Amino acid sequence: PTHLSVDTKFKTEGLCVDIPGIPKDMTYRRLISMMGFKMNYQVNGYPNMFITREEAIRHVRAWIGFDVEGCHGTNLPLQLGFSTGVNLVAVPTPLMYKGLPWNVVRIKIVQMLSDTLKNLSDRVVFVLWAHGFELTSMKYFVKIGPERTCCLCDRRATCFSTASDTYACWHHSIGFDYVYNPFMIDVQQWGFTGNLQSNHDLYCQVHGNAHVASCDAIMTRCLAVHECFVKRVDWTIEYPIIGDELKINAACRKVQHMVVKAALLADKFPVLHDIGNPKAIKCVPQADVEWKFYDAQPCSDKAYKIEELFYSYDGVCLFWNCNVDRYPANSIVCRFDTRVLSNLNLPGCDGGSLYVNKHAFHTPAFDKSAFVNLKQLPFFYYSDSPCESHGIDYVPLKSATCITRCNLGGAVCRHHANEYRLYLDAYNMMISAGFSLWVYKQFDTYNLWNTFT
Ligand SMILES: CCN(CCO)c1ccc(N)cc1
Ligand SMILES: CCN(CCO)c1ccc(N)cc1
Ligand SMILES: [Zn+2]
Ligand SMILES: [Zn+2]
Ligand SMILES: [Zn+2]
């Protein structure tokens, strides 16, 4: 039980307003045949165009919401909407394009999917709220067959070209006209009462219904993200490395150790209250401080209410990726900014985003008002390690934010210049990934200079 059986029943009630008289009894096998696709009894890696919810969750990076609305049925034009915000009008002869025949529309579809997905996934998963026209449009821009490899590289083929009779991945499909072996899932198969808008609006107020196909496509994908990543969470599922995951994660641990160590040296808190991940380890194990841990799993729906985390109840509080409505004034905070544009950050539900780095984390919408009792933490590098080289060429470092014994003495040593530059790169990596750092208002790096006396 890893793939969806073609002999599984498909509920057709949602399809009957576009396809009246459709049989109530139907399998994926008959549906695919009626869609105009021939599977020919083929065991060549593509057993079904449709996938299970479990397979869709593993390929969340491939998700593209797709809706088709009748503009006027082979006689009338269709409006194709995608969760990228693109609307294309195909004539049978928030960006809205004028009516064009399928031979040119299919070229635009391939270009758009390739530009969106090349740095995200090895495939496309059309996320539908199927009513009929969207499935009947597929024969006009999709070709299927055995699993193939790209003609210019080792990646699986996602596109086909009728001009050259060749196959390409999302990176090498320029000039290609067909989407090859796409996958799809109909959200209506999961069991819902009422229409798309009524189910979507129960959980999200950010996506409106401007009455166009792309709005429906965005709502459909948003509803699926809510069902799979908000109301249900699975932190065991592993996702492949597609970018700077490792460097970001290493930078996060380096920055956390730096900031907490410096806050303890500068303000000498007798106790640190570490709130968040129940598997947390002391980030500054050599510090004198009394370290107390409080368990809170990552919140995927709404930010935690501080009144609930503290059970309505000195030292400093550490909230490292623990999303709360309003941080206490005595805090050290790392909060992911959901607005960040990156290949790891997918659009989410109700302003939230789906951050995918080894595991998927639906993160509640970034809110500047959560940080009203704090200030932004400025960049600084602190080190009490010996000034000694051991082991790239050099230009002497001059920086007011290199808090070291050698800088206090008037000339930064080669070791601390190298470590400062490595730390600044890690810091910039973490910030550009979307993380934001906040600290108690009394934090002052000037208090770190007397640790070298
Ligand atoms: C959704 C696919 N489709 C439209 C033509 O491709 C269709 C499905 C079932 C029946 N019985 C007739 C038509
Ligand atoms: C900020 C630390 N703190 C008060 C110390 O006793 C606290 C934290 C969590 C709960 N649940 C209660 C209290
Ligand atoms: Zn390729
Ligand atoms: Zn939404
Ligand atoms: Zn030094």
Pair 250, 224 in one domain: no
Chain breaks in the chain (C to N over 2.5 A) after: 72, 93, 313, 391
Q: How was this structure determined?
A: X-ray
Paired sense of beta strands 178-180 and 142-143, if any: parallel
Tokens of 181: 């072996």
Cα separation, 435 vs 453, in Å, equals 34
Return the ligand 1 atom nearest residue 15 CA. Answer: 1
The Å distance, Cα 183 to ligand 4 centre, comes to 22
285 is a domain residue: yes
Paired sense of beta strands 271-276 and 374-376, if any: unpaired
350: number of Cβ within 10 Å = 18
Q: 120: left (phi > 0), else alpha (psi -120 to 50), else beta?
A: alpha
Annotated binding site: 67, 69, 134, 150, 153, 169, 172, 200, 204, 207, 211, 216, 222, 274-280, 387, 406, 413, 416
Tokens of 194: 């009422």
Residue 192 beta carbon below 6 angstroms from any ligand 2 atom:
no
Pair 177, 143 in one domain: yes
Quote the radius of gyration of the chain (alpha carbons, Å). Answer: 27
Pair 42, 161 in one domain: yes
434 is a domain residue: yes
- What is the per-residue burial (b if ≥16 Cβ within 10 Å, else e) of 269-286? beebbbbbeeebeebbee
295 is a domain residue: yes
Q: For 189, which DSSP code?
A: G
Pair 29, 95 in one domain: yes
Cα separation, 212 vs 207, in Å, equals 12
Residues β-bridged to residue 87: 81, 96
Residue showing tokens 């492949």: 240
Cα separation, 366 vs 452, in Å, equals 38
Q: What are phi and psi of 29, to 5 degrees?
A: -55, -50
Q: How many domains does the chain have?
A: 2
Element (H, E) at 253: helix 245-267
Return the ligand 1 atom nearest residue 136 CA. Answer: 6
Cα separation, 101 vs 65, in Å, equals 22
Pair 142, 271 in one domain: no
6 is a domain residue: no
Strands (E) in 46-175, as ranges, are: 63-70, 78-82, 86-91, 95-96, 100-101, 125-128, 142-143, 159-161, 166-168
177: number of Cβ within 10 Å = 22
Residue with CA closest to ligand 1 atom 13: 34
Residues flanking ion ligand 5, Cβ below 5 Å:
387, 404, 406, 413, 416
Residue 137 beta carbon below 6 angstroms from any ligand 1 atom:
no
Element (H, E) at 47: none
Tell me if 273 sits within 8 A of 317, measured CB to CB: yes
Ligand number with the minimum distance to the CA of 30: 1
Element (H, E) at 222: helix 213-225
Q: For 378, which DSSP code?
A: P
Q: 37: left (phi > 0), else alpha (psi -120 to 50), else beta?
A: beta
The Å distance, Cα 199 to ligand 4 centre, comes to 10
What is the residue range of 253's domain?
245-452
Could you give the C-alpha distances from 447 to 117, 330, 417, 443, 451, in angstroms and in order?
48, 17, 21, 8, 8
Element (H, E) at 271: strand 271-276
Residue 272 beta carbon below 6 angstroms from any ligand 2 atom:
no
Cβ-count burial of 254 within 10 angstroms (0-12 exposed, 13-18 middle, 19+ buried)? middle
Pair 200, 264 in one domain: no
Q: Which residues are catalytic?
A: 67, 69, 134, 211, 216
Pair 125, 250 in one domain: no
Residues flanking ion ligand 3, Cβ below 5 Å:
150, 152-153, 155, 169, 171-172
Count CA atoms within 13 Å of residue 141 on its CB side: 24
The Å distance, Cα 10 to ligand 1 centre, comes to 12
Could you give the C-alpha distances from 430 to 395, 419, 452, in angstroms and in order?
25, 16, 28
**At CA 109, angle to CA 103 and CA 114, rounded to 5?**
135
Count CA atoms within 13 Å of residue 321 on its CB side: 20
Domain's final residue, options 230, 258, 289: 230
Tell me if 334 sits within 8 A of 321, measured CB to CB: yes
Residue 312 beta carbon below 6 angstroms from any ligand 2 atom:
no
